[PDB]
């Protein structure tokens, strides 16, 4: 027999991959060997639209 879309997605072709080069970076917090108790302070400077997040991001 022939294949399914289910089954062709699992190989990783341009017909199925994510175009992540189009997105803004990943969103993580901070590594906590740095945040022992120091309670960093920061300032927001921009709010932006990400095509891979279904949510705005902030710099």
**Interactions with RNA, residue window 24-53 (CB under 7 A):** 31-33
8 and 14 Cβ atoms separated by less than 8 Å: no
Residue 21 binding RNA, by CB under 7 A: yes
**Out of 6, 13, 39, 54, which residue is the one contacting RNA (CB under 7 A)?**
13
Stretch that binds RNA, among 18-26, 37-45, 50-58 (CB under 7 A): 18-26
SS3 of the chain: the string is CCCCHHHHHCCCCCCCCCCHHHCCCCCCCCCCCCCCCCCCCCCCCCEECCCCCCCCEEC
What residues make contact with RNA under the rule CB under 7 A? 1-3, 5, 7-8, 11, 13-15, 17, 19, 21-22, 31-33
């Amino acid at each position: 027999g022939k294949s399914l879309i289910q089954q062709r997605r699992g190989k990783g072709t341009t017909t199925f991959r994510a175009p992540s080069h189009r997105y803004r970076g990943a969103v993580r917090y901070v590594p906590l060997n740095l945040v022992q108790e120091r309670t960093l302070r920061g300032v927001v400077e921009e709010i932006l639209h990400d095509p891979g997040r279904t949510a705005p991001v902030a710099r």
